[PDB]
Design a protein around this ligand. Structure first.
Ligand SMILES: CCCCn1nnc2ccc(C(=O)c3c[nH]n(C)c3=O)c(C)c2c1=O
Ligand SMILES: CCCCn1nnc2ccc(C(=O)c3c[nH]n(C)c3=O)c(C)c2c1=O
Ligand SMILES: [Co+2]
Ligand SMILES: [Co+2]
Lengths: 382, 382
């Protein structure tokens, strides 16, 4: 059941912003590891004396990496005279965020019809304001409210390429990498208490709970009207045999924050081949592969969706498969993106729910907690 | 003239330590960009609750990348009970260093006969102590004194692989990259006043001035007894037509610090081919190439050392050439390694001074300031 209760018009995920200590090195690592092209920049070379910001793109996926310069470079500026291209940026906030959390997502940005309206309605409905609406070059409006922890939900609306003040990156520095990733599918937060987090976010957005179908977590998914903006939230389950990975996150992250970004691939086999080739040469590592029992068990549950060759191709790449009543999903998880056991990435591809594909087709793979446990048990038995 | 006045026995450069905000992403970027293998680690997986440290190696070159975890993970520890593998590490110091300077070199480490003796003699001779000698697993001794800015000179001595508490990296995560880099040739600091910096460092080491043969800087080189540890220092020259790059460094770095690391290649043409292939896919960018006039002028000055083909190979790769009275050097400079216009890398290869090669063979390329100016002037004339 989808009551379509959005309190303002939401379009799609727009971008994800990481707050970094050095944006250059993180952006270069991510570019190579994920096959994203350098698309835009705002930094000293573009007149920004406040922050260095680099934009990577793959299809419609936009990853922004931002780090502060020395405050001394902009010490004469005031907000009316700022050279920052992202007016919500604050040196102190960014250094505090990174010192507290390490590398992670500061902003989950969604495109809306009217960012000022979205902000006003959100705050009138309980959202904690973070940065008021600001109009950039009479062309783009940006505003921010708190989502969870030190993560903000950023509203972007365009009158009519990324943001004013960003320059397109010259093609000589813009190598056209592409491993198949095309858009952000969902963005997941970890919180200490799921109930109040859901009540807060659903309260100010009107996002509705997205329907699904004893290992670590409780979770629920908030969704926009057309269910293309998907925001799952987890809480830990305490007093368990194996310690909750949600609790480990909260400890190493110093509290709530973004847990994982799920990136949709138009060809998950090509994406995983390309990413796995680069794991040990600057790219990203993946979770340990499930035992062959898991892939033996795949025939009985998805043998009508995937051929045997496609199933053995899943086995070569360590891909996981789950299934809804409407669709099937292929997914895999990276090891943490930085030093701390906190944020990671999921690669996903969905099969089914054609009309275009409806959002969330196949669910989020929660059936894979069960199947991974069973498959590991069966494999020890050999 | 080399008076061989070292006040303690110095062997060779041992390692360079970068203080990072996220050691993982910087180390992965550097590994791919420079062709260095992941060799050792000290982090949560090895029992270190204090800092994440990753060691890259190429030949004898050792680059260490370190970042702090949340202090909460080690809040119960005291120095006697620390899980840090580098006892000089301090959360507050590291966060202050990185917030002040951005990504950069914290420690220039040299291997000595006896680190405790080196420390005592250094401090008795004016060195400002930074971390007292500490013996690790009765096997290695480490101590630190201030060098310039927030950079320390680190003494390491071994009784008899990197440091106790570091684990060798498993070969599955250790891809054997190698683009030809073999050792650290020199490490260069920028300071506001060269005179007092030289007096200080030469005062506590006994390092002697290394002999050489109107654009931005004054500099001098301090050298160990066999001139294998080479520490140049620059100061700005003010009131010039083009603003001093040394002054720009000091402004963006918030003061004195390490300017460039010069990495010796056993085959600079292979190194530059491999690095340039990767510039736009996660690696390092290089300075703009000199005009063809520079390479036309190369025949008249090094035509007896390099063939025409080797000279056109320099031209394809943007390599610079200078010459002493004893040797010739090939060199090239990267663009800055991170967000700020501060630290960069030089790749170098030296020809001549065989006996083994004596240190500093060919000088440091200061003749290239002159030749670059002339070559740019001649090229505008066409
Ligand atoms: C070695 C680590 C593997 C451990 N594991 N095994 N099976 C999983 C199935 C689905 C999801 C996931 O992505 C979501 C769950 N619920 N929602 C809303 C989601 O997005 C994750 C993260 C895992 C997951 O980590
Ligand atoms: C576009 C930027 C090119 C500008 N430039 N042109 N010619 C150079 C020649 C030598 C050295 C160098 O490495 C040292 C000088 N003195 N000492 C002791 C050194 O190590 C450098 C850094 C340059 C240098 O930057
Ligand atoms: Co997911
Ligand atoms: Co040099």
């Amino acid at each position: 059941k989808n009551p379509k209760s959005d309190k303002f018009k939401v379009k799609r995920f727009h971008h994800i912003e990481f707050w970094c200590g050095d944006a250059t090195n993180v952006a270069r690592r991510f570019s190579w590891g994920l096959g994203m092209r350098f698309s835009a920049k705002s930094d000293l070379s573009t007149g920004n004396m406040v922050h260095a910001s680099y934009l990577l793109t793959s299809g419609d996926l936009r990853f922004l990496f931002t780090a502060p310069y020395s405050p001394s470079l902009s010490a004469g500026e005031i907000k009316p005279t700022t050279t920052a291209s992202i007016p919500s940026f604050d040196h102190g906030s960014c250094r505090s965020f990174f010192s507290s959390h390490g590398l992670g997502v500061r902003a989950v940005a969604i495109e809306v019809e009217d960012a000022e309206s979205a902000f006003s309605i959100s705050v009138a409905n309980g959202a904690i304001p973070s940065s008021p609406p600001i109009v950039l070059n009479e062309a783009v409006t940006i505003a921010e409210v708190k989502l969870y922890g030190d993560v903000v939900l950023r509203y972007v609306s365009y009158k009519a390429e990324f943001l004013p003040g960003f320059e397109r990156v010259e093609d000589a520095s813009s190598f056209p990498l592409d491993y198949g990733i095309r858009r952000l599918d969902h963005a997941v937060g970890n919180v200490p208490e799921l109930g109040p987090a859901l009540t807060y976010v659903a309260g100010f957005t009107g996002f509705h709970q997205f329907a699904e179908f004893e290992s670590g977590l409780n979770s629920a998914v908030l969704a926009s009207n057309d269910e293309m903006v998907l925001l799952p939230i987890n809480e830990p389950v305490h007093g368990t045999k194996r310690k909750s990975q949600i609790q480990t996150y909260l400890e190493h992250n110093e509290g709530a924050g973004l847990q994982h970004l799920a990136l949709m691939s138009e060809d998950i086999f090509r994406t995983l081949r390309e990413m796995r080739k680069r794991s040990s040469i600057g790219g990203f590592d993946f979770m340990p592969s499930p035992p062959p029992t898991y892939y033996q068990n795949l025939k009985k549950r998805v043998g009508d969706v995937l051929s045997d060759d496609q199933i053995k191709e899943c086995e070569e790449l360590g891909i996981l498969v789950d299934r809804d009543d409407q669709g099937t999903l292929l997914q895999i998880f990276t090891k943490p993106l930085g030093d701390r056991p906190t944020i990671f990435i999921e690669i996903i591809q969905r099969v089914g729910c054609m009309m275009y594909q409806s959002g969330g087709c196949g669910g989020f793979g929660k059936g894979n907690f069960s199947e991974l446990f069973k498959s590991i048990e069966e494999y020890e038995k050999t």
